[PDB]
A and B are shown apart, each in its own frame.
Chain A
Amino acid sequence: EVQLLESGGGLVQPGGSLRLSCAASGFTFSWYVMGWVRQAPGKGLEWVSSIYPSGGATNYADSVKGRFTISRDNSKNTLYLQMNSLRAEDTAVYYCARGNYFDYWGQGTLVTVSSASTKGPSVFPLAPSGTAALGCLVKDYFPEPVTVSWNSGALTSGVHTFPAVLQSSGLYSLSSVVTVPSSSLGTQTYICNVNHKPSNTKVDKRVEP
């Protein structure tokens, strides 16, 4: 029913600009207050901005005031967040949320403000050997996030993807593993599907005994 879907996340340089969207449905858009709320990694929620039904008026948190612009398009059921003069402080997941009291929320897009280059991960199989654990190493990338799945989505149970490390080099690395009966290692194939949108890195990798 109520759908709030975001886009526009990614890497941006300090002082650069970026525009987020939130596409909405399942309810009468133009009747609702909308706004943005953000959350820097492992830290707390912070209101960014809100905007009236008609789009005729706006409010801002002090820290982004002057630098951000909230707007809406009531015909296309879309909310925007123009973000200029970006500062490293603006690095956060950005939440789309409907109404006076945030009663519905999107899934968030992550915005990373750094001077640093994107970097594609290298992806390597993690070989095993009752039960057996096989897996995938997603090494040395920037910024977050990566998506990892198995056998093109088909394989879902027994699957665990670990939170990444931030190495002192400032790159990330993470793994994801899957527990399987060891008997199936002879007569079943395993390929991990890894996507890293900011560098257009898409990788498949077979994991063999």
Chain B
Amino acid sequence: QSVLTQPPSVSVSPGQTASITCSGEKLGDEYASWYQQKPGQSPVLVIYQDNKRPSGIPERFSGSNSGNTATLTISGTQAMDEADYYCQAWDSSTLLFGGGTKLTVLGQPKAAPSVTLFPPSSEELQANKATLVCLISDFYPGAVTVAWKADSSPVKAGVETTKPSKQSNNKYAASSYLSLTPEQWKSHRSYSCQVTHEGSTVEKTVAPTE
């Protein structure tokens, strides 16, 4: 089957005009459309039939079709335009999408994580398990490294960590879960969650409660 390829990522400085390209076999003999998808959101049609905007879509969205290439153009780019952008083409018989282009808007301020570490609930402990929860929110850029300590020693099993995911305010979130027995938890004086973000480390510590 035919492919529609898009750049997997595009970066633009604020106020400049984003350009997102779409190409495949025969795209100039076809109509191109484009969709904006924000995190946690349904797609939104921004351009159809190469270069028409639906009512409601701003004029700073433009589309063109030449060569074997469709191109989506966004002027006055700001951070609230960060999103996945999908080209699409019919004709034909089938409906082809592109793999999507991630639109990075540069110049967003670095933001350190708010971290919150939680001890197991009394209830879970009566249920004869234990779960430590490390919540990492509002950080930018979206890379964190997360380490766990029992007292002063690293924990090398029982750790479950999410990758970072873009919150609707363009900052990032992550979580990490350390599973233990009540005994393991009660042994040590404390557990720590250690999150390192862009060279700097935030650490939190809880203890059994007694």
Q: Taking the complex as formed, is A95 at the interface, i.e. its CB lies under 8 A from any CB of chain B?
A: yes
Q: Taking the complex as formed, is B180 at the interface, i.e. its CB lies under 8 A from any CB of chain A?
A: no
Inter-subunit contact A95/B175 (CB<8 Å): no
Q: Taking the complex as formed, is B86 at the interface, i.e. its CB lies under 8 A from any CB of chain A?
A: yes
- Given contacts A101-B33, A168-B160, whether A163 and B175 have CB atoms under 8 Å apart is yes
Q: Taking the complex as formed, is B153 at the interface, i.e. its CB lies under 8 A from any CB of chain A?
A: no
Q: Taking the complex as formed, is B61 at the interface, i.e. its CB lies under 8 A from any CB of chain A?
A: no
Inter-subunit contact A162/B119 (CB<8 Å): no
Question: A163 CA to B123 CA in the complex, in Å?
Answer: 23
User: Which size class do A's interface residues fall under?
Assistant: 35 or more
Inter-subunit contact A62/B94 (CB<8 Å): yes
Inter-subunit contact B118/A174 (CB<8 Å): no
Question: A170 CA to B135 CA in the complex, in Å?
Answer: 21
A interface footprint on B103-137 (CB within 8 Å = 1, 0 otherwise): 00000000000001011110110010001010101
Which of A102, A133, A173, A177 is the one whose CB lies under 8 Å from B43? Answer: A102
Distance in Å: Cβ of B96 to nearest Cβ of chain A: 7
- Given contacts A47-B95, A101-B33, A124-B124, whether A108 and B173 have CB atoms under 8 Å apart is no
Q: How many residues of B contact A (CB 8 A)?
A: 43
Q: Which residues of A contact B165 (CB under 8 A)?
A: 163
Q: Taking the complex as formed, is A106 at the interface, i.e. its CB lies under 8 A from any CB of chain B?
A: yes
Q: Which residues of B contact A106 (CB under 8 A)?
A: 42
- Given contacts A59-B93, A165-B160, whether A101 and B124 have CB atoms under 8 Å apart is no
Distance in Å: Cβ of A142 to nearest Cβ of chain B: 14
Inter-subunit contact B162/A165 (CB<8 Å): yes
Q: Which residues of B contact A101 (CB under 8 A)?
A: 33, 45, 48-49, 88
Q: Taking the complex as formed, is A167 at the interface, i.e. its CB lies under 8 A from any CB of chain B?
A: yes
Q: Taking the complex as formed, is A107 at the interface, i.e. its CB lies under 8 A from any CB of chain B?
A: yes
Inter-subunit contact A95/B42 (CB<8 Å): yes
17 contacts between A and B (CB under 8 A): A37-B43, A46-B97, A61-B95, A95-B43, A100-B90, A101-B45, A101-B88, A102-B45, A103-B45, A105-B42, A106-B42, A124-B121, A125-B121, A137-B133, A162-B174, A163-B162, A163-B175
User: What 7 A-B pairs are tightest by C-beta distance, nearest first?
Assistant: A47-B95, A101-B48, A124-B121, A105-B42, A126-B118, A45-B97, A133-B116
